[PDB]
Ligand binder design. Structure first.
Ligand code: 2S1
Ligand code: 2S1
Ligand SMILES: *[C@@H]1O[C@H](CO)[C@@H](O[C@@H]2O[C@H](CO)[C@@H](O[C@@H]3O[C@H](CO[C@H]4O[C@H](CO)[C@@H](O)[C@H](O)[C@@H]4O)[C@@H](O)[C@H](O)[C@@H]3O)[C@H](O)[C@H]2NC(C)=O)[C@H](O)[C@H]1NC(C)=O
Ligand SMILES: *[C@@H]1O[C@H](CO)[C@@H](O[C@@H]2O[C@H](CO)[C@@H](O[C@@H]3O[C@H](CO[C@H]4O[C@H](CO)[C@@H](O)[C@H](O)[C@@H]4O)[C@@H](O)[C@H](O)[C@@H]3O)[C@H](O)[C@H]2NC(C)=O)[C@H](O)[C@H]1NC(C)=O
Ligand code: NAG
Ligand code: NAG
Lengths: 243, 98, 98, 243
């Protein structure tokens, strides 16, 4: 039991320079934002699917496991939600700008007292970004508060023995608090008995027309089961089921 | 009613699932990316020596009965990378269903 | 009398065999290269995020009872690439013999 | 039954930039040339082995399969030769310069009549190079004769339907002819039903102190079982066993 989106226009890649496409364990990318930002004005997969009336609810939801070894690694539900991957009830935010899955982020507060996005800002919910992304200047100051050292390309490191004593980061969305604990916003990249704790916050300034933007990435979605509603142009969050 | 699509999780850095393109379906793993709106996969018409082409699954139009030629050039610029190729039209299966 | 060492052949482009470094031996695949005179393997003291470090087998001095610390910096410049690190001393087994 | 070279000084690599080390299916490199070109004047593995008297004959030989699917992919014999991987009897050349495994190459003749290395030149026998390497200017002219098109980084392409009708290349070493057929000097890089014929000759100028040099690589060794003699500082060749 699957779904078949006929007459779908896609790209046949002939040139993929840079290390990104050598580092990628996947073959390509299935874009799931709005037709608005589609390259060569190609109708998106979910858009063509909605048009062929292959779903009763024009929504798609994501469960992302935060345990690499946990099976399955995640689940995309097309045409509904999966209640067994989330706890409690969904909380919705409206899409501001219908290009990316953009929402209004009220503020980012650190338990130590530090405040970023102090008077509100714009954020996108991006499944294809592993980390939380914030502006260079705001993230540098955030990483001073957690005591993380600079690494490369806007990334940071924390000595794992310090991770437990770190403060909680809270993201205010729809007037509601979205708490990420130190464990939630730090990646434990382990191999051969060597463990390196990587900050789940990255410093990158997105330039206009697109930005500035915060990117709520896999760090956030992994903690909060996300619902993408094209019927009502809203985003849903619920604490994701975990062990 | 709703279509479940299992995702693989590589080191909490990359989440991807399996799709199909063609009749009969050719399988590819893709990132269902909410930060973009295009769909693309490697072509059989890429340089075999290029690391990115060789190590991934390549789409072959000749193996598909539902392929519709387009040919329009495309260029995509993501946060972490750039790729180019050409446009084609075919059926997309979710999951692959070989 | 003579020691046979089986080699793997990757696409007629790379031939390599398995060796051991340490007591107990830690296994690594190496190119028995007649165009050079040094022996090196990835260290456990390399950046986990660096593609080359992660995807290969790393040597860990702490797991070896025959390791003798040196520490002298080294830099090698081959036709196709460059690498750097530091020198160490230990027993090398051919083949690995775990 | 193996061999254990004690107190061996090696490198613990911490930085491996460039795509080479991402493209490599192996972990490192065991250098087998003379102590003369050893970085940081570290005693080589075969040298330390000879000193610990772990072999009766201070020689090592290589069998390299030219069928990727053929098992084993090759065989390194330490302290002898493997008569079951070669046909007939060994032919020896003396090592000119005892740094690389350098020999005098009398000339390179193409059956079409073209001559490269016309009045003799210097060549190294390098197991760690897949292709035959020659000077840029001489190889460009050689690839015109075989009708091969330029590719990138001194490499070339031949349409596979033309490969069979190509001329034989002969390398004169020790006054003896070393014939490579079109199949011997062209790599059939196949995948997903796509076949690309790659020239086994690459154009690269090695600068002094090292060069200029020809590199007799895996293309040559795969056809001719090679013996490396540190006792008598010579190189042996015999037609390798094939099916
Ligand atoms: C370390 O953490 C990460 C950091 C980043 Br920045 C990404 C990342 O590039 N994600 C891509 C998807 C993708 C592409 C290629 C490879 C991928 O995975 C790998 C990555 C590395 C190695 C191996 C695999 C993932 C988009 O989801 C980001 N986005 C939207 C947000 C955004 C918006 C705007 C701008 Cl400027 C920049 C950004 Cl990051 C995009 O790439 C947007 C691309 N884009 C459009 O689609 C578009 C349409 C119209 C106008 C302009 C644009 C535009 O810039 C991923 C990360 O880990 C997974
Ligand atoms: C496409 O065909 C190929 C082309 C080349 Br050029 C090589 C290659 O670099 N071989 C290296 C070994 C090696 C190292 C790292 C990776 C390797 O494998 C991969 C390669 C790509 C992707 C994945 C894996 C292999 C040496 O055997 C070459 N040599 C001696 C000759 C030579 C001599 C001199 C000079 Cl300038 C240049 C050369 Cl090519 C060397 O690298 C020599 C290094 N070197 C010394 O050792 C030395 C000591 C003292 C002074 C100077 C030198 C010196 O330059 C390999 C090829 O395919 C396998
Ligand atoms: C190859 O496939 C392409 C589609 O994947 C074909 O080109 C595109 O065709 C679609 C419709 O199928 C067009 O989309 C419509 O665009 C209008 C207007 O938006 C934009 O139009 C112009 C086009 O020149 C563009 O430059 C502007 O920026 C506009 O924003 C919308 O109102 C519609 O709702 C719909 O989205 C694409 O515009 C068109 N693209 C191009 C580049 O022309 C193409 O024809 C196929 N080729 C072959 C040979 O079959
Ligand atoms: C770390 O290990 C190193 C060895 O792997 C140690 O340094 C090297 O030690 C060897 C002997 O074990 C020396 O080799 C000898 O060199 C002489 C002369 O050749 C060269 O000598 C100088 C050295 O400064 C060099 O600069 C010149 O270019 C000469 O060509 C030979 O005649 C011998 O036969 C033998 O090969 C190395 O020279 C020496 N290297 C260096 C850089 O000093 C090192 O001591 C060890 N470190 C620790 C802390 O234990
Ligand atoms: C979203 O829009 C609806 C109207 O369609 C409104 O009832 C709701 O309060 C809005 N919520 C937010 C968070 O903007
Ligand atoms: C190699 O040197 C030996 C003397 O050690 C000599 O008999 C032989 O003819 C030489 N052969 C070549 C090819 O140089």
């Amino acid at each position: 039991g699957g779904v078949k989106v006929e007459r779908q226009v896609f790209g046949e890649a002939t040139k993929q320079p840079g290390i990104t496409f050598i580092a990628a364990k996947f073959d390509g990318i299935l874009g799931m934002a709005y037709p608005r930002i589609s390259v060569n004005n190609v109708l998106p997969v979910f858009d063509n699917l909605m048009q062929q009336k292959l779903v009763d609810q024009n929504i798609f939801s994501f469960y992302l496991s935060r345990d690499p070894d946990a099976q399955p690694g995640g689940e995309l539900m097309l045409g509904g939600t999966d209640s067994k991957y989330y706890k409690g009830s969904l909380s919705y935010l409206n899409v501001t700008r219908k290009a990316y899955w953009q929402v209004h982020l009220d503020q980012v507060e650190v338990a130590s007292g530090l405040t970023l996005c102090k008077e509100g800002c714009e954020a996108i919910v991006d499944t294809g970004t592993s980390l939380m992304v914030g502006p260079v200047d705001e993230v540098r100051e955030l990483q001073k508060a957690i005591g993380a050292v600079p690494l490369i390309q806007g990334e940071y490191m924390i000595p794992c023995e310090k991770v437990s004593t770190l403060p909680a980061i809270t993201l205010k969305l729809g007037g509601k608090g979205y708490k990420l604990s130190p464990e939630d916003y730090t990646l434990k990249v382990s191999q051969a008995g060597k463990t390196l704790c990587l900050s789940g916050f990255m410093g990158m300034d997105i330039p206009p027309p697109s930005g500035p933007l915060w990117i709520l990435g896999d760090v956030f979605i992994g903690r909060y089961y996300t619902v993408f509603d094209r019927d009502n142009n809203r985003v849903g969050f619920a604490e994701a089921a975990r062990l | 009613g709703p279509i479940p699509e299992v995702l693989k999780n590589y080191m909490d850095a990359q989440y991807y699932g399996e799709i199909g393109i063609g009749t009969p379906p050719q399988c590819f793993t893709v990132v269902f990316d909410t930060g973009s709106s295009n769909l693309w996969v490697p072509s059989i018409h890429c340089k075999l020596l290029d690391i990115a082409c060789w190590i991934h699954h390549k789409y072959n139009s000749d193996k598909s009965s539902t392929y519709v030629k387009n040919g329009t050039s495309f260029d995509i610029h993501y946060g972490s990378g750039s790729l180019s190729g050409y446009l084609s039209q075919d059926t997309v299966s979710v999951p692959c269903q070989s």
